[model samples]
Target: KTTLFCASDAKAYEKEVHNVWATHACVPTDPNPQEMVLANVTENFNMWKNDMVEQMHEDIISLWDESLKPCVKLTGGSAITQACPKVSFDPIPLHYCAPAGFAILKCNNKTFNGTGPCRNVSTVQCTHGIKPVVSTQLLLNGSLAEEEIIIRSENLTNNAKTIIVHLNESVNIVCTRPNNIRQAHCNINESKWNNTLQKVGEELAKHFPSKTIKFEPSSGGDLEITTHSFNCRGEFFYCNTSDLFNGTYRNGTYNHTGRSSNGTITLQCKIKQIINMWQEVGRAIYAPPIEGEITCNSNITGLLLLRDDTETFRPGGGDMRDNWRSELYKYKVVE
Candidate 1:
């Protein structure tokens, strides 16, 4: 028995969408609601998202099992054999020889020639032939080497190392030297390498429990910010930088501003209001400002709050993008 299975465009689409979503939106924190909604819709439009992934996994396994049936019978069958006849015939003026016992089987075939000459002649059809089993062995070591090459080229050591650590908690990775040691020795100094390794290690340790790191490269390179004092915290404010700007006071006094610097406005009770506003925005957006920390303990508290809150309250247990899009669409129609 032979079984054939070909993947459909839908299946391919499903795989592509799964990869895209898993790669892009698989962050610990939730995405903004608007973005999440859009992503959900897009994933659904392709029909190759969450549910499709599960289905594909099952289908591929089943297909593999079905394909092995033919091999099973072939392995159990008898060996095939073939051989040429002893005598040969040639039509020539010089000399001619004909097969001694058997006449060659031709298109114009008859059962037998004569009992005396070709009575002992017999034909035997070859049985099934042996075929080598097709199999593959995936060495985890080989995969690790390939992964290392890719990670090094992309400068994703931190992230890749983190991923490795996540898979094997006991494994520890350190970025020591480049592949081309000669080139590195000539161009880069020991101090530089040490510094680089230190920084990379720090980043790797940042997400210790999760064992994941994200490296983003930029033209400007890395920047470090040190707070001098908590009393003089950094304040970021944005206002219209126009020469002909007018300020309206609550006492009905209007003042025109021309290249005048406005004093820093100290936020007192507005801090709580601002925090609440951030919470609302976080909820609406469906993304946390930070990751992990659910409260005011860390910067990611906002992000955690947003994700937890949205997932807890929103329909479909979170943002209705991707697998939940169809349900959302159905709900919208009914409403």
Candidate 2:
């Protein structure tokens, strides 16, 4: 799901408030109300959070299962096929036409015509097994070379090495595992290519591979993928910097005073303002502030008068207006 499942907290809040009143506020208890309240809140929050997340996961899984219903024809059928009587092309459904050795049959509006003429019943028996055969494509921003995406359902490894997606950028995944796959779908960003698919990659890393390294499309609805024979596509992004900007500075400090000193005083003041702006922008973007040494230009010939620290050279001789005059002199001077 695109947005979070916002579980209603009003009921919980109301109950907790009442509990607080009953336990401590009305008849004072020796059990320490603060600790009791905190523990209760924490417990309730965990319960709600887990319940919401589990429901969301289950919803997606059900959607994927529904998509592959057409392909699921036989279960516990023979692993190998035995020949059946020659049947007419008109009677079979499209999914039931898959045979072990023969090509899958296609249906026209009237009858099957795609296979060669003079056809006997090429009805290769449909065989079913407890293995998963799934295929899907992934769209991504960055590139990955020679990686395997492992499949897991109900806490067991589905396929280990069969799903090698050599994503130079985009990826095509064909995976098969030991147990039955009831459902499958990918939302690239939140979808599976990167999220689910990359997660599968991590699974491979954990079990078999000796060593490895790794690592949005806003998507809605569940993906439809067939378990026995199916294919679908989705998108994921890593670090596409196209949508970001080096935002403007809006801190309320450095005003460019018209009273000038060869733009050097204003330049120094502006430099400080620029630094503040940079820091703010980085914070907004969820990045650490960039660290660097800031130095004034050596050729800048102007007195940078210190307002807070001015006591060593002159011992309390100047008044406030006298200090203002000194500031004016400092800004107006050539050196």
Candidate 3:
């Protein structure tokens, strides 16, 4: 803003420059080159803020396309497959003014196609302004497995501006047993990746049994992950009943009777998405091997078997503890 006019117009009209400089100098006399850039900066900032304050809530439009450039045009209706990073100006539905010139953007997906494409988003808007963090969930085999997001506090035009919300059509997971060198692959190819997870899930169930298991949790519905903890106790045959005592099933049972035993359990179970793997694909298609101590004596307790083996014969000759309950002479002890 040149105070010669705004400044002159300040005190009265066309002659207030000298007096206006006394209040606050909006225009500079002896300034550096950086101030010139800042002059351009302030103009755009005020313009954008005004645009947001006035025009944005009423009339929405393309802020930018992928690659962090100002969007060339609000392209025709279709799933954008390339250069898809979305920077949107959102406040309800924006009314655009095109010559011809207004096309209602009805997106089948949930987000704007500023720079990326996906299936579920609100009316899309894009820009090269500051990148807003986007949070989305990954539904695996119909089970919401994880939530992903990108967070930034600076202008995206200078950084990687495009964001891809990729939910892979297929995932390959592998699990192994540390002590036994047992390994298995849980590859859900396009055909195998069904909505029902029972088949694919069983594969992990099989692998983690003779193994330990843990999930370095991450964002899902409303959860996050942490792992890389609780190694093999640094001692052989170490026991941690916390897994059993804090378990939901046993707690549900004890919540009824004050105490209960379901059975032995494997405490060594963990699921960690290799951090670097997620960095590239935006999600973990294959979890990198957990090199730390993941194996364990998963049996955190002996209560169930304790009660089973040490049961006393009742006076009435009936006890539920006996396996087969002596139907086919379960007591035969011959060599």
Estimate TM-scores for all models.
0.15, 0.15, 0.15
* Candidate 2 lDDT, 193-296, residue by residue in tens: 22332443344345443333222111111121101112211111011111110011112111121123332111111111011011011100111211332121
Task: Please give, for residues 1-335, the per-residue lDDT of candidate 1 as tens digits.
Answer: 11112111122233332222323322222122111122112111111132322332333334322221111111224422232111111100100011233211111111111111122222211101111111110001111111111101112232221111111111111111122111110011223223322333333333233322222111121010000000001111111112211121112222322233232211111000011011011210111111121111000000000101001100010111211211111111000
Q: Go through the candidates in order and give each one's C-alpha lDDT.
A: 0.17, 0.19, 0.19
Query: Considering summed lDDT, which 10 consecutive residues are worst modelled in model 2?
Result: 270-279
TM-score quality measure for candidate 2: 0.15
lDDT of 3 by residue, 180-260 (tens): 221311112222222212222232233224222121121112111111111122111111222222211111121111122
Candidate 2 local Cα displacement, residue 96, angstroms? 38
- The superposed Cα distance between candidate 1 and the true structure at residue 64, in angstroms, equals 0.9
Which parts of model 2 are misplaced by more than 4 Å? 1-49, 77-231, 234-335
Q: What lDDT would candidate 3 get against the real structure?
A: 0.19
RMSD of each: 34.0, 35.5, 28.5
